[PDB]
Amino acid sequence: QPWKALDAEQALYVYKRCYEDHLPSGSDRKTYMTLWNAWRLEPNDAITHCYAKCVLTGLQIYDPQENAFKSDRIPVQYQAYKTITQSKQKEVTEYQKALAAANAKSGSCVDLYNAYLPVHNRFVNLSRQLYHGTVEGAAKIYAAMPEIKQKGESFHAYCEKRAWKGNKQSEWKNGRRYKLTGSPELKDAIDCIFRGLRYMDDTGLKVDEIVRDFNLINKSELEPEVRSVLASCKGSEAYDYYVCLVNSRLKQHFKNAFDFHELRSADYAYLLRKVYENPEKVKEEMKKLNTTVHF
């Protein structure tokens, strides 16, 4: 439309969300994480198969609507960061071509895993350069592109910095609160945050993502109320939904869910080993990072 390359934060989001959605719980967690951290598509079972599908989909190498590997996106991803990665054009073309040969078949987890596996085995190092899959390589991207939300920085803090960048004092100067002012700066900050938390994207509202945040604070029973509050909200801007949630019977639960996501948005590894404890613990953890917490 044309296709837009993914930055380091966008790639990190894909990796961490796929870990969250595919890592097993219990003793098996460490085993899979050790292999996947090393970029090994092992073991050869359904857990890894669907993890692979998740990452291919998130990096937009696989398109689920077309059920197709999108070979021509690889050179686009390369071109966007080539001065930083120093990846070789010859190898990029070879990677593109290997993807063009790949057969998605049904698009099932195993079909995509089987098709992608030899491509991965051949081009793993290049793929980690192109898609910001090394700590050192990603660091170069953040250093060259200060406009990307950094690791350790919450979306709320990143967005605050860009919403209040003039003479007017930030509404969150003493710490972020839930005061509803309807100011242009607050509306901007909230739009930036909703997009950063994947509550909204270019296709609009993601009701399921907001529900996920309530599930993550152990409030699964509130799902129908979360859906109802969003559904009855007049207006379709991020700020409108935020106002609807804050002014509803869900108020305190939303604050807890949104605050927990602030923490998680600063530390993309947070859930990958820790679970939700309580609001006071969240606040203490946020003090260690670049967040909008009260000190």
User: Cα–Cα distance between 31 and 42 in angstroms, integer?
Assistant: 10
Decide if residue 12 touches ligand EAH (CB under 6 A): yes
* Start-to-end Cα distance in the chain: 45
Q: Which stretch binds ligand EAH (CB under 6 A): 21-29, 49-57, 163-171, 217-225?
A: 49-57
Q: Which of 9, 13, 15, 197 binds ligand EAH (CB under 6 A)?
A: 15
3-state SS, residue 69: strand
Q: How distant is the alpha carbon of residue 26 from its chain centre? A: 24
State yes or no: residue 200 binds ligand EAH (CB under 6 A): no
Smallest distance from ligand EAH to CB 215, Å: 24
CA distance 230 to 250: 11
> What CA–CA distance (Å, rounded) separates 287 from 293?
6
Q: Which of 13, 32, 36, 270 binds ligand EAH (CB under 6 A)?
A: 36
Q: Which stretch binds ligand EAH (CB under 6 A): 130-138, 212-220, 258-266, 275-283?
A: 130-138
- Check: CB of residue 205 under 8 Å from CB of residue 244: no
The residue count for binding ligand EAH (CB under 6 A) is 18
Under the criterion CB under 6 A, does residue 120 sit at the interface with ligand EAH?
yes
Candidate list 6, 50, 56, 216; residue touching ligand EAH; CB under 6 A: 56
Which residue positions form the known binding site for thromboxane A2? 36, 51, 151
Beta-carbon contacts of residue 217 (< 8 Å; ≥ 6 apart): 253, 256, 257, 260, 276
The upper half-sphere exposure of residue 225, i.e. CA atoms within 13 Å in the direction of its Cβ, equals 14
Report helix, strand or coil for 199.
coil
Q: Could you say which DSSP state residue 204 is in?
A: E
Binding marks (x or -) toward ligand EAH, 132..161, rule CB under 6 A? Answer: -xxx--x-----------------------
CB 268 within 8 A of CB 12: yes
Q: How far apart are CA 102 and CA 288, in angstroms?
A: 45
Q: How far is the CB of 131 from ligand EAH (least distance, A)?
A: 5
Q: Which of 39, 88, 168, 249 binds ligand EAH (CB under 6 A)?
A: 39
Rule CB under 6 A: is residue 59 a binding residue for ligand EAH? Answer: yes
Judged by the rule CB under 6 A, the positions of this chain that interact with ligand EAH are 12, 15, 36-37, 39, 41, 52, 55-56, 59, 61, 120, 127, 131, 133-135, 138
